[PDB]
Amino acid sequence: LYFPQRLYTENIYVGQQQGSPLLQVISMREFPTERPYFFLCSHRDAFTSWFHIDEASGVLYLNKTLEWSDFSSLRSGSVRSPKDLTLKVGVSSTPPMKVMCTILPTVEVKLSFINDTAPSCGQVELSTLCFPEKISNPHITENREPGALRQLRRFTHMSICPNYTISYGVVAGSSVPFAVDDSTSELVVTAQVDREEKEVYHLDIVCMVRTERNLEEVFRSLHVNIYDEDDNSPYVQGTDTEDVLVEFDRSEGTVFGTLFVYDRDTTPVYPTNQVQNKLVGTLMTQDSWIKNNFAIEHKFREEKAIFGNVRGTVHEYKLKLSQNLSVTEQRSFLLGYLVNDTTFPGPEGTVLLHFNVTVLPVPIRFSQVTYSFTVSQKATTYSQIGKVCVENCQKFKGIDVTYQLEIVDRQITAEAQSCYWAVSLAQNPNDNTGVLYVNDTKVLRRPECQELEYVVIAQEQQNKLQAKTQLTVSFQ
Amino acid sequence: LYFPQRLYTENIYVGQQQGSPLLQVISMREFPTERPYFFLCSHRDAFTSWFHIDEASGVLYLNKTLEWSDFSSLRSGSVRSPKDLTLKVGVSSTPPMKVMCTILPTVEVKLSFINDTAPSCGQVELSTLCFPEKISNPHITENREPGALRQLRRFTHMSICPNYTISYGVVAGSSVPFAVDDSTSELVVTAQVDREEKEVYHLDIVCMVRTERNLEEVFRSLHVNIYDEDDNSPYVQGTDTEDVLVEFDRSEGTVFGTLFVYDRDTTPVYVQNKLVGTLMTQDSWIKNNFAIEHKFREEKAIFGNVRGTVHEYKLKLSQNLSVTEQRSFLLGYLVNDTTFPGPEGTVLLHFNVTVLPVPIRFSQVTYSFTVSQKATTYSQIGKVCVENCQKFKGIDVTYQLEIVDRQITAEAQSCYWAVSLAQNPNDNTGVLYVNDTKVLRRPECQELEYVVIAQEQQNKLQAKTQLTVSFQ
Ligand SMILES: *[C@@H]1O[C@H](CO[C@@H]2O[C@@H](C)[C@@H](O)[C@@H](O)[C@@H]2O)[C@@H](O[C@@H]2O[C@H](CO)[C@@H](O[C@@H]3O[C@H](CO[C@H]4O[C@H](CO)[C@@H](O)[C@H](O)[C@@H]4O)[C@@H](O)[C@H](O[C@H]4O[C@H](CO[C@H]5O[C@H](CO)[C@@H](O)[C@H](O)[C@@H]5O)[C@@H](O)[C@H](O)[C@@H]4O)[C@@H]3O)[C@H](O)[C@H]2NC(C)=O)[C@H](O)[C@H]1NC(C)=O
Ligand SMILES: *[C@@H]1O[C@H](CO[C@@H]2O[C@@H](C)[C@@H](O)[C@@H](O)[C@@H]2O)[C@@H](O[C@@H]2O[C@H](CO)[C@@H](O[C@@H]3O[C@H](CO)[C@@H](O)[C@H](O[C@H]4O[C@H](CO)[C@@H](O)[C@H](O)[C@@H]4O)[C@@H]3O)[C@H](O)[C@H]2NC(C)=O)[C@H](O)[C@H]1NC(C)=O
Ligand SMILES: *[C@@H]1O[C@H](CO[C@@H]2O[C@@H](C)[C@@H](O)[C@@H](O)[C@@H]2O)[C@@H](O[C@@H]2O[C@H](CO)[C@@H](O[C@@H]3O[C@H](CO[C@H]4O[C@H](CO)[C@@H](O)[C@H](O)[C@@H]4O)[C@@H](O)[C@H](O)[C@@H]3O)[C@H](O)[C@H]2NC(C)=O)[C@H](O)[C@H]1NC(C)=O
Ligand SMILES: *[C@@H]1O[C@H](CO[C@@H]2O[C@@H](C)[C@@H](O)[C@@H](O)[C@@H]2O)[C@@H](O[C@@H]2O[C@H](CO)[C@@H](O[C@@H]3O[C@H](CO)[C@@H](O)[C@H](O)[C@@H]3O)[C@H](O)[C@H]2NC(C)=O)[C@H](O)[C@H]1NC(C)=O
Ligand SMILES: *[C@@H]1O[C@H](CO[C@@H]2O[C@@H](C)[C@@H](O)[C@@H](O)[C@@H]2O)[C@@H](O[C@@H]2O[C@H](CO)[C@@H](O)[C@H](O)[C@H]2NC(C)=O)[C@H](O)[C@H]1NC(C)=O
Ligand SMILES: *[C@@H]1O[C@H](CO[C@@H]2O[C@@H](C)[C@@H](O)[C@@H](O)[C@@H]2O)[C@@H](O[C@@H]2O[C@H](CO)[C@@H](O)[C@H](O)[C@H]2NC(C)=O)[C@H](O)[C@H]1NC(C)=O
Ligand SMILES: *[C@@H]1O[C@H](CO)[C@@H](O[C@@H]2O[C@H](CO)[C@@H](O)[C@H](O)[C@H]2NC(C)=O)[C@H](O)[C@H]1NC(C)=O
Ligand SMILES: *[C@@H]1O[C@H](CO)[C@@H](O[C@@H]2O[C@H](CO)[C@@H](O)[C@H](O)[C@H]2NC(C)=O)[C@H](O)[C@H]1NC(C)=O
Ligand SMILES: *[C@@H]1O[C@H](CO)[C@@H](O[C@@H]2O[C@H](CO)[C@@H](O)[C@H](O)[C@H]2NC(C)=O)[C@H](O)[C@H]1NC(C)=O
Ligand SMILES: *[C@@H]1O[C@H](CO)[C@@H](O)[C@H](O)[C@H]1NC(C)=O
Ligand SMILES: *[C@@H]1O[C@H](CO)[C@@H](O)[C@H](O)[C@H]1NC(C)=O
Ligand SMILES: *[C@@H]1O[C@H](CO)[C@@H](O)[C@H](O)[C@H]1NC(C)=O
Ligand SMILES: [Ca+2]
Ligand SMILES: [Ca+2]
Ligand SMILES: [Ca+2]
Ligand SMILES: [Ca+2]
Ligand SMILES: [Ca+2]
Ligand SMILES: [Ca+2]
């Protein structure tokens, strides 16, 4: 059972008689043998015993003839007319119990108690007799059993105008799965519908009234919203496999591959707790190295243009690094990822995704070309002289290399050790590059201090791998 | 003219005699008829008058027979020994003049004056007869003259073993453009070289020593570096045109495409081989909204055996484009290799830009949420989102809830305290949450109806849809 309508409304008047019908609450069956049992739930309120709902038909009736004192005694806190009354109506597929009112779905019946006697039939405009002032739009879910949807007669007004005949119809320009049941005056849905074909049905209702004058007609435009269920399995467009190379970029959080999965069903905006149409993924590997270093990132968003202008869901799966992978690691594996549409009925609601991963090692090493820098200008403290970099260091990401200058010859006099102050080195972690700059220019005034031979030492941090190269600086 | 090596070193000994050769400074020609003129530059030092260099040959000679007194009087009182002597040698393309010592490049000659006589023949290994102690790895410039690179013979030790005859040769793993001149014992480079083909050569020098009953040989490993010149023009790999679509991401700083420009030459940051670009437009609108992002790196991997330069060009936004913008233009960008001789040092890049407006509208005509009566304060109810709002960048959209029924009593108004809305600028959504649970005890407060209004900041474009919240 579900309710195609969350709120009912009507006016009630002083002098309205015991036993007169007010409105009909509708429950739609989710299965053909399901039978509704209606009951009132507002037993917390005193006014609820002014009313009676028929357990089988769902028609709500006055249980008491309304009086002036009934109006004035409503403790709402607003002394003004009209006083709104809110009733709760419950429905169940078994015989009703008191506790269902606290625990089952209910409908709100909002009544406006007007502190006056009912209007005379000559005082009601045909449009009001025919159709509520503001018509709320019903909703049904796709793939459901046809059934009555809305009682079209205004019960209260046909008692004001008892000598009028009133019939309703669906005006069908195109063929629509909606009609009126002439015998009950209900709008009914005549077939199962498909949210993926149409999410909103526009309807024009015609009311035909035989007056003392002629047969009159009034038209009312409304529409029915179609709710979605998970009735489409996810699928890939093109490949289910993404080739991933891990080499010079090994930094955590970087994305190395992206696979897209599509689902024609809708999903609440990401991220959500709803379980309808949720896709849950699972790494298809028992392997500690893979699990502790790699991870899949899942996101989804609504799209419609790619689905033929029908709202569905686009999923993105991205292979991510958990932590900076050591430059010595080298592995090639085919990583499966099972994507399961959990609420898709039957065992065809999954897609297997594949990440074909190549992880190459990254050597730590200078080219065999040693550096020689010539400073043809008079040295100025802090002027950059040159840069040092291991092979392909400028492509590195997630690899920390630190550079150091050291003196080539060891058995060197104390005085000769000072010529090497002329140049120093700074880390440019922007690239993992080394920047040579001038330091002490005072030592350059010595002709022996104008040709410097250094060793540059690079050190990868995670594994402590070292590379060396030679470096000469000529102050000219 | 250029020096293949910037520092020479040798030993000199007590008892070494006037006129004995010590070593040979090398200058490498950059034109076929260019010739070097060598000269000593050392001014104030007393030991400079001890030496002489042949202006034509570059051979440094002793101009004085070294006595014990010469050593102890050199910087008297210093306890160092040996005592290092630094000489400066200059070269010129025309007849040397005094002023040239101040304004033309020089190499340093560092002589170690040993306070002893030379070793006897029986004391030295053959390698000290053949080679200098310090290994020096020379350099040569690509696209220059072949010629003598290094004197291999060790002049100071010639007489240490008078009956030994000494000659030299080169061996490598591959064929190499290097050889020994039999007549001068010079290592020669026999061809012009191309840095782009080979950046360093690894040679083994062989010294053949003919003793009184044997032909012996000792080896020395050497490396010759090739200095890079800007002799390659930049080029594009594949297409010189990038199609760029500006839609949902329109924030300042966003990069839209990558054009790759390659240059085989190296690029020292500290003007050689520098590529400078120019925006090919006068359009005020374009310039005020777009710039070209240029980054570059040096790389051996993409070029193979020899380091080259990779440049990346990307069209970047200078500010958030209004969602109402819509225009298509073709934007040229000229990249110039400013030190490449001739007019072929430039490449024209193109950006083919389509900028599309972004509509501000709901694609869902109704949001319906169902929440527990026992729901706790601040628990998330759901999210709303204008069409494609999760792709938005540089677009400011806010969301607001409005009550539908305006003719509402004060008591019914308090029902709408149960729900509030928070902005989620991260993904451009609004977040509904539970606010006041106390009003949920009232049956009239359990079905709420709102209008959701989204408003784009710049243009005040609005979108509106229905939202219902049901407390069950
Ligand atoms: C809901 O609707 C109620 C009924 O609607 C009215 O009657 C319908 C039949 C119809 O014609 C409709 O159009 C009418 O609006 C309405 O109740 C009405 O209230 C008024 C105002 O009080 C009242 O008129 C006064 O009646 C006094 C006493 O009358 C006696 O008889 C009536 C009914 O027969 C009873 O309700 C009364 O309780 C009495 O039994 C008269 O004395 C009065 O005349 C003079 O004095 C009053 C001063 O009274 C005011 O102060 C007292 C004390 O504080 C209050 O208790 C009282 O309510 C007044 O506010 C002065 O106002 C006069 O101008 C005059 O100076 C006057 O005639 C109607 O009789 C009464 N009708 C009915 C049927 O009871 C109610 O107000 C509506 N409520 C809302 C929220 O909309
Ligand atoms: C969120 O909920 C709070 C109330 O819940 C309390 O705060 C939560 C954050 C949470 O901690 C709960 O656990 C906690 O109980 C709402 O706050 C109330 O807001 C209303 C309206 O602003 C206030 O009522 C007004 O009070 C005014 C004087 O203070 C008075 O002038 C007003 O009357 C005027 O306006 C009304 C219509 O607005 C009109 O009908 C009148 O005739 C007159 O013109 C009105 O009485 C309450 O005092 C506030 N309560 C508290 C405790 O601060 C908050 O609004 C809500 N946020 C939402 C829904 O966005
Ligand atoms: C430069 O070097 C000389 C050293 O000359 C020699 O050659 C070098 C390579 C080394 O092998 C030295 O050991 C040699 O001496 C220095 O002059 C010498 O210094 C030493 C140490 O101070 C002196 O040794 C002294 O010798 C005294 C006696 O020596 C004389 O008399 C003996 C008689 O047996 C005779 O055999 C000898 O030849 C000397 O004529 C000895 O009593 C004393 O204890 C001390 O050991 C040596 O005498 C010095 N000169 C000579 C000619 O021997 C210089 O000082 C050094 N210069 C600098 C600036 O450091
Ligand atoms: C500059 O770019 C436009 C637009 O290109 C479109 O948007 C970009 C962001 C890129 O992603 C492009 O891939 C994309 O198409 C170019 O005009 C466009 O040309 C294409 C053809 O290449 C048109 O597509 C269709 O092609 C089929 C052929 O199968 C035809 O039958 C269709 O009639 C249609 O031509 C596309 O419609 C067209 N777009 C517009 C707005 O005209 C443009 O050529 C390019 N200029 C360059 C590269 O110099
Ligand atoms: C998984 O990938 C390997 C290697 O793929 C290479 O590296 C990727 C990062 C990507 O750039 C691919 O295009 C590369 O080819 C595949 O093995 C290679 O397959 C190609 C096919 O033409 C072949 O030319 C190579 O020789 C192969 N290399 C090796 C080392 O075998 C492999 O087939 C992929 N596996 C699956 C199941 O897709
Ligand atoms: C850098 O040089 C200093 C000496 O020069 C000072 O620093 C320069 C960068 C510049 O600011 C000058 O004007 C300064 O006078 C070296 O400092 C010496 O370090 C050694 C050993 O660490 C120590 O024995 C000396 O006493 C220090 N002398 C002074 C004056 O500080 C420093 O080592 C150099 N750092 C390098 C080369 O990395
Ligand atoms: C996909 O998810 C569904 C949802 O739970 C799984 O369906 C259950 O599978 C278990 C066995 O693993 C059965 O005992 C249940 O009866 C199944 N239905 C349920 C729980 O509603 C399904 O197995 C998953 N498919 C996979 C992992 O391939
Ligand atoms: C993984 O690599 C990144 C980038 O190379 C490292 O990031 C730096 O980490 C140090 C560690 O103290 C910080 O001081 C720096 O501020 C970080 N800089 C940047 C740009 O990220 C990171 O530390 C490495 N390891 C981990 C576990 O993050
Ligand atoms: C590419 O860059 C070169 C080098 O800057 C430009 O050549 C110079 O242009 C100026 C401007 O007229 C002249 O005065 C110089 O004589 C030119 N040569 C040098 C060495 O500066 C050249 O114009 C640029 N090419 C383009 C197409 O803009
Ligand atoms: C109608 O009201 C009377 C009270 O006068 C009560 O006894 C009876 O049970 C009520 N009927 C219904 C259906 O609520
Ligand atoms: C309806 O018609 C009957 C019979 O003609 C008449 O008795 C009754 O009063 C009429 N009712 C109205 C509201 O006109
Ligand atoms: C070299 O050989 C000759 C014999 O031909 C011999 O007389 C001489 O002493 C040897 N040594 C030197 C240093 O000449
Ligand atoms: Ca469907
Ligand atoms: Ca569906
Ligand atoms: Ca689905
Ligand atoms: Ca070249
Ligand atoms: Ca070059
Ligand atoms: Ca170049």
Numbering used by the authors:
A (entry chain A): 23 to 498
B (entry chain B): 23 to 292, 297 to 498
Per the authors:
Crystals were obtained for a zebrafish RET construct spanning residues 22–504 (zRET22-504) with glycosylation site mutations, N259Q, N308Q, N390Q, and N433Q (defined hereafter as zCLD(1-4)red.sug.). Diffraction data from these crystals led to a structure determination at 2.2 Å resolution. The crystals adopted the triclinic space group P1 and contained two molecules of CLD(1-4)red.sug. within the asymmetric unit. The final zCLD(1-4)red.sug. model contains residues 22–498 and includes 7 N-linked glycans well resolved in the electron density. The amino-terminal CLD1 is packed against CLD2 in a fold-over clamshell arrangement as anticipated from human RET, while CLD(2-4) forms a “C-shape”. The limited size of the CLD(2-3) interface is typical of a calcium-dependent cadherin domain pair, with three calcium ions (Ca-1/Ca-2/Ca-3) and their coordinating ligands dominating the interface. Differences in the CLD interface size indicate flexibility between CLD2 and CLD3 but rigidity between CLD3 and CLD4. Superimposing chain B onto chain A, aligned through CLD(1-2), reveals that the rigid CLD(3-4) module pivots about the CLD(2-3) calcium-binding site interface with a variation of 12.3°, which leads to a difference of 18.4 Å at the furthest point from the CLD(2-3) interface. Comparison of site 1 of zRET in both the crystal and cryo-EM structure reveals differences in the conformation of residues 288–298 from a CLD3 loop. In the absence of ligand, this loop packs against CLD3 core (loop “down” position) interacting with the β4 strand.
RET receptor tyrosine kinase plays vital developmental and neuroprotective roles in metazoans. GDNF family ligands (GFLs) when bound to cognate GFRα co-receptors recognize and activate RET stimulating its cytoplasmic kinase function. The bipartite GFL-GFR complexes are recognized by the RET receptor tyrosine kinase (RTK) forming ternary RET-GFL-GFR complexes (Cacalano et al., 1998; Durbec et al., 1996; Jing et al., 1996; Treanor et al., 1996). RET has four consecutive cadherin-like domains (CLD(1-4)) and a membrane-proximal cysteine-rich domain (CRD) in its extracellular domain (RETECD) (Anders et al., 2001).
